[PDB]
Amino acid sequence: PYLQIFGQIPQEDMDVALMEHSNCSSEPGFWAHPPGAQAGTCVSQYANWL
Amino acid sequence: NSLIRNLLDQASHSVGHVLRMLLGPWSDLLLWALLLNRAQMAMYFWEMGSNAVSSALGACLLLRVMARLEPDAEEAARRKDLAFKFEGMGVDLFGECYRSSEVRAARLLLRRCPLWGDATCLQLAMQADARAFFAQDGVQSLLTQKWWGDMASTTPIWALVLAFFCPPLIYTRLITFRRRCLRRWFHFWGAPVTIFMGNVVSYLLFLLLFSRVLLVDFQPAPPGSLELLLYFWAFTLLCEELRQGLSGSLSQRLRLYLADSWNQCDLVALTCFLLGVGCRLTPGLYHLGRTVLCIDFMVFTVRLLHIFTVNKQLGPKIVIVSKMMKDVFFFLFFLGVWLVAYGVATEGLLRPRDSDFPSILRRVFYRPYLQIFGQIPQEDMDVALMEHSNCSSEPGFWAHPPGAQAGTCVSQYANWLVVLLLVIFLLVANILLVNLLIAMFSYTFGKVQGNSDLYWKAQRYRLIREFHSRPALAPPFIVISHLRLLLRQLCRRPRHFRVYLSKEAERKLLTWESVHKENFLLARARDKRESDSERLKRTSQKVDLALKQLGHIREY
Amino acid sequence: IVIVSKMMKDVFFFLFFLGVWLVAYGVATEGLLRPRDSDFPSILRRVFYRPYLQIFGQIPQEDMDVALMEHSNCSSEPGFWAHPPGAQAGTCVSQYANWLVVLLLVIFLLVANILLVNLLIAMFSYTFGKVQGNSDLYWKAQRYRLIREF
Amino acid sequence: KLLTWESVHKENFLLARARDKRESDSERLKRTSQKVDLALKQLGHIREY
Ligand SMILES: CC(C)CCC[C@@H](C)[C@H]1CC[C@H]2[C@@H]3CC=C4C[C@@H](O)CC[C@]4(C)[C@H]3CC[C@]12C
Ligand SMILES: CC(C)CCC[C@@H](C)[C@H]1CC[C@H]2[C@@H]3CC=C4C[C@@H](O)CC[C@]4(C)[C@H]3CC[C@]12C
Ligand SMILES: O=C(COc1cccc2ccccc12)Nc1cc(Cl)ccc1C(=O)O
């Protein structure tokens, strides 16, 4: 988020629309594993609009 | 001693023309006190002397150039605030004659004085650096009218440019003025504003043509028609620059022409173009010729910027931008030191195996410089975004990066410290630097606008003068005007405003300005008699006089 | 509202300066580097559009620096070309003076993103400080006019 | 009613301004100068004594 100030905005890592949907976790939810290296191997998307 | 007898002995044993003319009526005692720096004597001599304009103006020329020739601080200072107050009460002397008779003041300006050497008040002002005189609204209006000479100085700009584009439009209901042919034609084509418009159109056409030749038609092949006509245009431009340097005593003219740094950049631009043409014509230096022509486009275009300055809504601010250069120097120095620091720190922490001199020089300055403008190689610097490998034989983790010039084989041992240093760099440079810079820009801009405007008045005046001196024709066709003026020098081998004023109209104007000047004397006479401090003084010498009178009758 | 209406002279000022400086730098760049796609629309794009986005973080460094491109003989004219990976930056760029190319790019970034914008910032600050009271009184008048129509 | 009201208020305003230029410092210097040179004149009228 500090790089977020200076134009380094990981939009493709943060927005559900830009990441491909997959069942990367066993928890009953929608995840859509992002392609970022240190953005987490399996993130959630329940309130990604928020 | 001082500046009187030493200079008089110098003249006897021997602006400089004035000293030669003088040797050992109201004008005579006037100049005597001005050389002798008798302040009160001098103001009295002037006030009860003739040609009050013109003469406070000549005396202020002498005062200013004298304070410039004065080796003593005190006489320079007293001489210069004498110049200040003389010029001030002269400019409102001119204002009171101006608000009384517009045309009479106008014809007061362009009057020939048998005084200090036949320099019109405008020349007196420029040589005296009378920026206050120039900024005076009356002379501002007169110079505006001259810049629009015979061109209906109140005419709209759009009508004028449409008239320039449509020569038949000159004979219409629009664009009024002051063989109606030929004469109207010459007045229009010789008006300084039309000269400026034509010059701007010509410069724009030249820059378009030169860009077109550079971009599409600059093959290694021998130059074509476009390039040849470009060379011809540039030869015309070189000719006009050298001829205006030679026109506006050949050595003296050259030396004064080395001044006016605008002219200096124009000359360096043309010298660059000559070298570019030489490199182009020689087969070997073709790529070098291309590069030098490209960098020459820079100086042409930046010269156009100073060419366009005359605009009233633009000129003061263009003068402004010329005062930020020290600020950008400061911020440049500080960015440079902080930048070279951070870069050396980065290539010290991380060890690329591409330790080449050009690669290191790139990586240490160029990339971190782009890190300010959003080009941050995060995926090239952080260990968490990049893949690990056994790249180098040196013991330690290396993790070859995916970058092209970030070094083929980086080190990651203290990459956490590398990340922290990157955070510190982003905190300092992207936040502190530019922001303190824009704050001090705001300060320096708020402290310089007024003297930029008053300077712009005189700058615009100088531009109008030189453009009035410029030949009528346009740079594309300025070959005809060059053959004319060369013939004006070549048909001389076998062979600035100056509006005349009438006799006894000289007496009318002098008395009129004499009447007005004595009215201004008596007006500031009431002003000082009613001033609060002087009225307190007056009450003092009416009450001390009263007490003296009581003392005279005290014996009663 | 009156202030943002009055700032129009200042925005004109910045527009003219930006335009002259961008056309300068764009022509210099298209001269110093020689794509083989010298079409009229392509040149028109590359000379104004891209250098305009150069001010807002859209830097085609991978399209203009020799250190980030791959070298190939994409043109018959003698000299190294190193075809770029871009889409409209030309199919075959020239690299003869790419060091000077980088230097001129640095000069552009220094002049544009520092000098012009920040001087314009000061220009707005000044013109906002000098006309706010007149804007308020004119707003009183204009509000009266507006309620008159309503 | 409104005419006389605004006229009364206007004459109070004229009297307020008349007195305001009767304690203003510049006009007080003016009136003090008038008093002092009137004193000079009247002392002149008794100088013959
Ligand atoms: C005020 C002017 C001089 C600024 C410079 C702008 C120049 C560089 C721009 C404006 C229009 C552009 C032209 C647009 C179309 C063409 C036709 C093509 O077949 C050759 C290139 C050429 C001629 C372009 C060259 C660059 C160009 C001429
Ligand atoms: C903050 C300011 C000073 C940044 C300056 C950036 C300069 C130093 C950068 C930008 C491009 C870089 C150049 C890129 C190409 C070359 C050509 C090579 O044959 C010598 C190194 C040299 C010349 C590099 C040296 C460093 C360099 C000139
Ligand atoms: O043209 C200039 C200055 O031009 C430049 C200055 C600094 C760097 C430059 C780099 C490239 C091109 C031009 C540059 N004119 C003036 C400068 C001052 Cl201080 C006063 C009067 C004038 C004037 O023209 O009257």
Residue numbers in the entry:
A (entry chain A): 970 to 1019
B (entry chain C): 470 to 483, 503 to 512, 558 to 711, 766 to 835, 851 to 1097, 1108 to 1168
C (entry chain D): 920 to 1069
D (entry chain D): 1120 to 1168
Text taken from the publication that reported this structure:
Transient receptor potential (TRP) melastatin 4 (TRPM4) protein is a calcium-activated monovalent cation channel associated with various genetic and cardiovascular disorders. Genetic defects in TRPM4 are found in patients with inherited cardiac conduction disorders. We determine three cryo-EM structures of full-length human TRPM4 embedded in native lipid nanodiscs without inhibitor, bound to NBA, and an anthranilic acid derivative, IBA. We determined cryo-EM structures of full-length human TRPM4 in endogenous lipid nanodiscs in apo (HsTRPM4apo), IBA (HsTRPM4IBA), and NBA (HsTRPM4NBA) bound states at overall resolutions of 3.7, 3.6, and 4.5 Å respectively.
The anthranilic acid derivative NBA is a potent and specific TRPM4 inhibitor, but its binding site in TRPM4 has been unknown, although this information is crucial for drug development targeting TRPM4. Analysis of the HsTRPM4IBA and HsTRPM4NBA structures revealed discrete densities for the IBA and NBA molecules located at the periphery of the inner membrane leaflet in the pocket formed between S3 and S4 helices, S4-S5 linker, and TRP helix. The additional ring of the naphthalene substituent of NBA was an important fiducial marker for the overall placement of the ligands in the density maps. In both HsTRPM4IBA and HsTRPM4NBA structures, the hydrophilic anthranilic acid moiety containing acidic, amide, and chloride groups faces towards the cytosol interacting with charged amino acid side chains from TRPM4. Notably, the anthranilic acid moiety interacts with His908 from the S4 helix, Tyr1057, Gln1061, and Arg1064 from the TRP helix, as well as with Ser924 from the S4-S5 linker, and Ser863 from the S3 helix in both structures. Our structures show that the naphthalene substituent and the 3-iodophenyl ring of NBA and IBA bind into a hydrophobic pocket between the S3 and S4 helices of TRPM4, making hydrophobic interactions with the residues that decorate this pocket, including Val901, Val904 and Leu907. Compared to wildtype HsTRPM4, NBA dose-effect curves on single variants of the HsTRPM4 channel show a drastic increase (up to one log of difference) of the IC50s for the NBA, suggesting a decreased efficiency of inhibition by NBA. Compared to the wildtype construct, but also to single amino acid variant Ser863Ala and Ser924Ala, a more pronounced decrease in the efficiency of NBA of up to two logs of difference is observed in the presence of the double mutation Ser863Ala/ Ser924Ala. Based on our results and these previous studies, we propose that the binding of NBA or IBA to TRPM4 may restrict the movement of the TRP helix, maintaining the TRPM4 channel pore in a closed state even in the presence of activation stimuli.
